[PDB]
Write a protein that binds this ligand. Sequence first.
Ligand SMILES: COC(=O)N[C@H](C(=O)N[C@@H](Cc1ccccc1)[C@@H](O)CN(Cc1ccc(-c2ccccn2)cc1)NC(=O)[C@@H](NC(=O)OC)C(C)(C)C)C(C)(C)C
Lengths: 99, 99
Amino acid sequence: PQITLWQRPLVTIKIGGQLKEALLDTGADDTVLEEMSLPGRWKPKMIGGIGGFIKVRQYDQILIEICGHKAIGTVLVGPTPVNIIGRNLLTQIGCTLNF
Amino acid sequence: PQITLWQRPLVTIKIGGQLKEALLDTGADDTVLEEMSLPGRWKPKMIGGIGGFIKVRQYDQILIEICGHKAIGTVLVGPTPVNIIGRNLLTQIGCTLNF
Ligand SMILES: COC(=O)N[C@H](C(=O)N[C@@H](Cc1ccccc1)[C@@H](O)CN(Cc1ccc(-c2ccccn2)cc1)NC(=O)[C@@H](NC(=O)OC)C(C)(C)C)C(C)(C)C
C-alpha cells in the first residue's frame, strides 16, 4: 500500500497473539512496543529518543504481522508512549520512502 | 527519489542560508533541528518523545529546501540529538511510504 503522511501512518499489527496499532517510523532504528505480554526470554536494554533514555526488554526472533506482511526480528517492550515499528522491521516488509 | 530503509534516511537540507543533514521521520508530527541560528521571532514551546520532553523555539513560515525541494512551514529549534524533518514538511515535498 502507498501511504501519504497527512495523518499518522498507523498500521494494524499482530504480535504475541494480540492485535495492536503501531506507527511506521522511518526515524526509528528499533521497534518499540508498550507494555504487553510476550513469551520467552529477554535481555535488558536502554534506548534513546528525544527527551532521554528509556529502559526496555529486548526480545529477538519475534514474529510480527504488519498490515498482513510477516517479519521476524527484535522487538523492544517498555514505557514508550506509542507503539513504534522501526527500520529493523520496515526493511523486511519492503517499505520505502518516496518523493 | 525512492529511498530504502537499510540505512537512516538522511538528506541534505538548506535552511537559514546554511547546510545540514536531516532525518526523514514519518514518526515525527513536527520538524526539529539542533541549535542553529535563525532570523526572526519565535515562541517557547514544549515537545515530547521517547525519553521525555524538550523545550524548543518555534518558528512559523520558515523556508527549507529538502533534497532540492522547497517547503515553508514551522521549524522548531532546540536540544535534539539529530535534525528531524517531520510530517508537517514531508507532506509538502510529496513524500510517501510504500510497501
Ligand atoms: C537511534 O535512536 C532512535 O532511533 N530513537 C528512536 C526515536 O526516538 N526516534 C524519533 C527520532 C529520534 C531518533 C534518534 C534520536 C532522537 C530522536 C522519531 O522517529 C520517532 N518519534 C517517536 C515518538 C512518537 C510520539 C511520542 C510521544 C511522546 C510523548 C507523548 C506523546 N507522544 C514519542 C516518540 N518521535 C518523536 O520523538 C517526535 N514526537 C512526536 O511526534 O510526538 C507526537 C518528535 C521528534 C517530534 C519529538 C526510538 C527511541 C523510537 C527507537
